[PDB]
Write a protein that holds these residues in place. Structure first.
Motif, PDB file in Angstrom:
ATOM      1  N   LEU A  87       0.868  -1.199   0.000  1.00 36.17           N
ATOM      2  CA  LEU A  87       0.000   0.000   0.000  1.00 36.17           C
ATOM      3  C   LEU A  87       0.894   1.236   0.000  1.00 36.17           C
ATOM      4  N   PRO A  88       0.793   2.143  -0.996  1.00 34.92           N
ATOM      5  CA  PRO A  88       1.610   3.355  -0.987  1.00 34.92           C
ATOM      6  C   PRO A  88       1.454   4.141   0.322  1.00 34.92           C
ATOM      7  N   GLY A  89       2.587   4.548   0.884  1.00 36.98           N
ATOM      8  CA  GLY A  89       2.639   5.308   2.144  1.00 36.98           C
ATOM      9  C   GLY A  89       2.885   4.438   3.367  1.00 36.98           C
ATOM     10  N   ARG A  90       2.860   3.113   3.252  1.00 37.49           N
ATOM     11  CA  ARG A  90       3.151   2.228   4.406  1.00 37.49           C
ATOM     12  C   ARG A  90       4.631   2.355   4.763  1.00 37.49           C
ATOM     13  N   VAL A  91       4.919   2.427   6.055  1.00 32.01           N
ATOM     14  CA  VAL A  91       6.305   2.430   6.582  1.00 32.01           C
ATOM     15  C   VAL A  91       6.448   1.211   7.488  1.00 32.01           C
ATOM     16  N   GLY A  92       7.450   0.388   7.200  1.00 34.34           N
ATOM     17  CA  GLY A  92       7.840  -0.741   8.051  1.00 34.34           C
ATOM     18  C   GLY A  92       8.888  -0.327   9.065  1.00 34.34           C
ATOM     19  N   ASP A  93       9.578  -1.308   9.619  1.00 30.52           N
ATOM     20  CA  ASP A  93      10.536  -1.072  10.721  1.00 30.52           C
ATOM     21  C   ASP A  93      11.840  -0.447  10.215  1.00 30.52           C
ATOM     22  N   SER A  94      12.200  -0.640   8.947  1.00 31.33           N
ATOM     23  CA  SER A  94      13.576  -0.363   8.455  1.00 31.33           C
ATOM     24  C   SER A  94      14.057   1.045   8.795  1.00 31.33           C
ATOM     25  N   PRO A  95      13.271   2.127   8.568  1.00 29.94           N
ATOM     26  CA  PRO A  95      13.792   3.475   8.788  1.00 29.94           C
ATOM     27  C   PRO A  95      13.579   3.983  10.217  1.00 29.94           C
ATOM     28  N   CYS A 152      17.476  -5.185  11.365  1.00 33.48           N
ATOM     29  CA  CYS A 152      16.399  -6.196  11.299  1.00 33.48           C
ATOM     30  C   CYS A 152      15.888  -6.394   9.874  1.00 33.48           C
ATOM     31  N   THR A 153      15.196  -7.507   9.678  1.00 36.76           N
ATOM     32  CA  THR A 153      14.454  -7.793   8.432  1.00 36.76           C
ATOM     33  C   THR A 153      13.302  -8.732   8.761  1.00 36.76           C
ATOM     34  N   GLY A 154      12.107  -8.387   8.323  1.00 36.13           N
ATOM     35  CA  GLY A 154      10.971  -9.300   8.497  1.00 36.13           C
ATOM     36  C   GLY A 154       9.653  -8.590   8.345  1.00 36.13           C
ATOM     37  N   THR A 155       8.659  -9.055   9.098  1.00 36.03           N
ATOM     38  CA  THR A 155       7.284  -8.510   9.153  1.00 36.03           C
ATOM     39  C   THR A 155       7.350  -7.180   9.911  1.00 36.03           C
ATOM     40  N   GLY A 156       7.454  -6.097   9.159  1.00 32.98           N
ATOM     41  CA  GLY A 156       7.789  -4.768   9.684  1.00 32.98           C
ATOM     42  C   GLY A 156       6.937  -4.407  10.880  1.00 32.98           C
ATOM     43  N   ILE A 206      20.532  -9.078  12.473  1.00 31.29           N
ATOM     44  CA  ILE A 206      21.982  -9.244  12.705  1.00 31.29           C
ATOM     45  C   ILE A 206      22.365  -8.300  13.834  1.00 31.29           C
ATOM     46  N   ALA A 207      23.290  -8.741  14.669  1.00 28.52           N
ATOM     47  CA  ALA A 207      23.674  -7.984  15.869  1.00 28.52           C
ATOM     48  C   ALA A 207      25.134  -8.231  16.202  1.00 28.52           C
ATOM     49  N   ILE A 208      25.796  -7.169  16.632  1.00 27.24           N
ATOM     50  CA  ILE A 208      27.161  -7.232  17.204  1.00 27.24           C
ATOM     51  C   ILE A 208      27.133  -6.465  18.516  1.00 27.24           C
ATOM     52  N   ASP A 209      27.639  -7.070  19.579  1.00 21.20           N
ATOM     53  CA  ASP A 209      27.694  -6.385  20.891  1.00 21.20           C
ATOM     54  C   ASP A 209      29.062  -5.720  21.074  1.00 21.20           C
ATOM     55  N   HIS A 210      29.181  -4.934  22.138  1.00 24.67           N
ATOM     56  CA  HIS A 210      30.384  -4.109  22.414  1.00 24.67           C
ATOM     57  C   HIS A 210      31.594  -5.016  22.674  1.00 24.67           C
ATOM     58  N   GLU A 211      31.364  -6.286  23.024  1.00 22.25           N
ATOM     59  CA  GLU A 211      32.438  -7.278  23.302  1.00 22.25           C
ATOM     60  C   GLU A 211      32.827  -8.018  22.012  1.00 22.25           C
ATOM     61  N   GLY A 212      32.191  -7.703  20.878  1.00 20.14           N
ATOM     62  CA  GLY A 212      32.522  -8.286  19.565  1.00 20.14           C
ATOM     63  C   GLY A 212      31.841  -9.624  19.300  1.00 20.14           C
TER      64      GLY A 212
END
Ligand SMILES: [Cl-]
Ligand SMILES: [Cl-]
Ligand SMILES: [Cl-]
Ligand SMILES: [Cl-]
Ligand SMILES: [Mg+2]
Ligand code: NA
Ligand code: NA
Lengths: 135, 158, 157, 135
Positions: free
Chosen positions: D26-34, D51-55, D100-106
């Motif tokens: 639907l034009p104008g829908r915003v998911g999680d990405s931004p 992230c990636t998935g069901t926004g 995907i995730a990286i913590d401060h300890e690598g």
């Protein structure tokens, strides 16, 4: 910016926030108001929150969700979570403003770090409290 | 605990030296009327979602507060309105940003939550979604007030 | 901790049965080239912020992935692109949503972060801000690919 | 949707996410990405997440910030926070996808609850790893 939070007789929490943004705003700028977890959040497990202030800082700090997470995961009281976010974390990022919050136990908090916040609150069947300036 | 409502009409540099008591009482009266409406709805067993929706609709309608009628002006002397609503029971939420032709952004946000699978709609797409579902298209100028136009002129001098 | 990069090109119903090994290798080759660029930049002392910006720019440029070139089509046979970038050091962020005339949304998000006092811009206002900062205007047609157009047609046929 | 997270030699974390949305959107829908804290978050104190998935579910659950808050306030490891968010909370709200995730300890994590996630990772000066399907 305006907002409301409520706890109903069925123990449900809700939050809402609405704004015109800022005088002389850059067209297309979005502040915290329409962003879940920034300007508006509600979860029966924790808290309902509506925010008002420096939009950019309330987004970067996820202010509304941060209240919820400090309570739910950190074990902070509503008052402690509100003090931490509004009086410590937001000013550390150059943010000004406040929020209103009700927890699932019916505790209410209206913290702000500004000269004023137009605000009011009341328990069902009681006299409401109104305010503009600091105490 | 007891059913309870809180509302706000914005935080910032609200200056007492520049206000009269009669000026302050206009804001106090508006806040008290809206919180009292919410208290009466809660006492009557209305849902938290309906109470915050109605309180924010009334704060939108009230020209004193920067939401809906009484919205501030952009750099281009336009209005761009944003709103969000969240249900703590279902964790459903609805939000609109950058809308100019919807009288009550909080009602458009509730429409996104209830009449779509989505959380957030922006701009013309948000407006078209609302119009396709019978929400009225309003003149973009219905929100304009002299007080907020004067504040734009003052901002342009700083 | 030791410097490190991770990337993704999207999660979903990626079907082994519908894929050939040659099709899979195109994705593996693209992912490996991009993660190797990021590793080399990190090794050379480039910032995490510049590394994630460049990695996402390359994922945008790659037609295999639904971002930038190879963006899916909306119901109106249009493209609407969104991006965000966040710096863990300053907690600054920049984001754009609903942009159609910017080749690399992540670079527009970085522009909001670095060249404005704002965090989020939308639609034509975001585009006009980016154009004022010298970012090129492109036709939304540049993102269009046969693969994604055929997926739209399959969804509505 | 695409994304990247990184930890540099100076100890700084960063995240980025970019998308075209969904086929037939639907034009104008915003998911999680931004949305900061939904599809993208970074904080040197905790984690960088894309992230990636069901926004909609990633917004409602503030997935990216929830990883950070579970670690910072809850004391969860990166692995524990990723399991809680991706394998428990997001499915419970009817969401699918990964992050995907990286913590401060690598530490690095690439959780997903879907059939696949196009992904790769590698430590500076080390050999990269790629994946499409489940292990
Ligand atoms: Cl903290
Ligand atoms: Cl007062
Ligand atoms: Cl102030
Ligand atoms: Cl694999
Ligand atoms: Mg090795
Ligand atoms: Na108003
Ligand atoms: Na691409």
């Amino acid at each position: 910016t305006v907002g409301a939070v409520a706890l109903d007789l069925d123990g449900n929490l809700a939050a809402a926030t609405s704004t015109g943004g800022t005088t002389n705003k850059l067209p297309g700028r979005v502040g915290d108001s329409p962003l879940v977890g920034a300007g508006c959040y509600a979860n029966n497990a924790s808290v309902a929150v509506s925010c008002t202030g420096t939009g950019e800082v309330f987004i970067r700090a996820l202010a509304a969700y941060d209240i919820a997470a400090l309570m739910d995961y950190g074990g902070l009281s509503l008052a402690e979570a509100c003090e931490r976010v509004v009086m410590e974390k937001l000013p550390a990022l150059g943010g000004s403003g406040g929020l209103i919050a009700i927890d699932h136990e019916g505790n209410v908090a209206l913290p702000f770090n500004t000269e004023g916040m137009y605000r009011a609150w009341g328990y069902a069947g009681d006299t409401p409290t109104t305010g503009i300036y600091r105490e | 605990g007891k059913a309870v409502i809180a509302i706000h009409g914005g935080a910032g540099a609200i200056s007492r030296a520049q206000m009269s008591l009669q000026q302050e009482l206009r804001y106090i009266e508006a806040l008290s009327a809206i919180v009292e409406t919410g208290q009466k709805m809660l006492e009557a067993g209305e849902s938290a979602l309906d109470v915050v929706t109605e309180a924010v609709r009334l704060l939108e309608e009230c020209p004193l507060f920067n939401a809906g009628i009484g919205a501030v002006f952009t750099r281009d002397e336009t209005h761009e309105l944003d709103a969000c609503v969240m249900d703590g029971n279902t964790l459903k939420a609805g939000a609109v940003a950058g809308v100019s032709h919807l009288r009550n952004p909080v009602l458009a946000a509730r429409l996104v939550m209830e009449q779509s699978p989505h959380v957030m709609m922006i701009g013309e797409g948000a407006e078209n979604f609302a119009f396709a579902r019978g929400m009225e298209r309003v003149s973009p100028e219905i929100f304009s007030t002299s007080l907020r136009y004067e504040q734009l002129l003052a901002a342009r001098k700083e």
